[PDB]
């Protein structure tokens, strides 16, 4: 069983890739080829983004996938098979690349922004969520202190409505 089901939407392919590669070690090995592939796609503005279009022919889709894999052994591992399978199954998997990254984080990294009344963009890369959270929050407050602005606490709206409606 994967760390948590990603609720589909072309995330089925990524979920299956995570499960199969988790049968093997294929964890950093899987994510590394994916990161290289995504970087390569970004490295070609066109022919790698316009290549992520439905209009690409089946021969064209297989050829584009093969050419992307042609960047030496940057397409090493089961990611090659997944890319070829998608080449006819579903053309667009950049979101599937991000989902593979999400699965990798779920396997190893975890963590997401808390929120509540803060709009901060931090991270807490630790399995536990009962110790490091406070340290991460205080650090991100005392270091950087970027645009975490929710404008104001919604309780202002709460009190305003509460008083304004008897």
């Amino acid at each position: 069983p994967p760390p948590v089901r990603l609720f589909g939407v072309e995330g089925t392919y990524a979920t299956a890739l995570y499960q199969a590669a988790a049968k093997n070690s294929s964890i950093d090995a899987a994510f590394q080829s994916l990161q290289k592939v995504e970087s390569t796609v970004k490295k070609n503005p066109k022919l790698g983004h316009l290549l992520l279009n439905p209009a690409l022919s089946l021969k064209d889709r297989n050829s584009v996938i093969d050419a992307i894999v042609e960047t030496h052994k940057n397409l090493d591992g089961y990611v090659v098979n997944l890319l070829k399978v998608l080449s006819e199954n579903n053309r667009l998997g950049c979101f599937e690349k991000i989902a593979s990254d999400f699965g990798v984080l779920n396997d190893a990294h975890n963590g997401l922004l808390k929120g509540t009344v803060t709009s901060a963009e931090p991270l807490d890369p630790k399995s536990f969520k009962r110790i490091e959270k406070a340290l991460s929050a205080s650090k991100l407050v005392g270091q950087g202190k970027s645009l975490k602005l929710e404008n104001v606490v919604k309780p202002e709206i709460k009190g305003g409505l509460i008083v304004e409606l008897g």
Partner: protein, 85 residues
Amino acid sequence: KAQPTEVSSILEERIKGVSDEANLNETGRVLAVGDGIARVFGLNNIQAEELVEFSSGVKGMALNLEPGQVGIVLFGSDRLVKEGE
């Protein structure tokens, strides 16, 4: 590092003209044609309610635009065109 450049230029090439010099921005690639409908990927400059030359000798109207394909109703018989033209 010539391999990445060669691969990218080959990928951009061998594509006839769909992504070679056109990118389907001014002309269009017809994904499918139901009856007079023409779900077309391309024509990234055609406005709503557009008369378009479907390159099959039959004109038609682009009377709706969507996320990734434009449904350009055709002003002629369906067989008169073909998918992918």
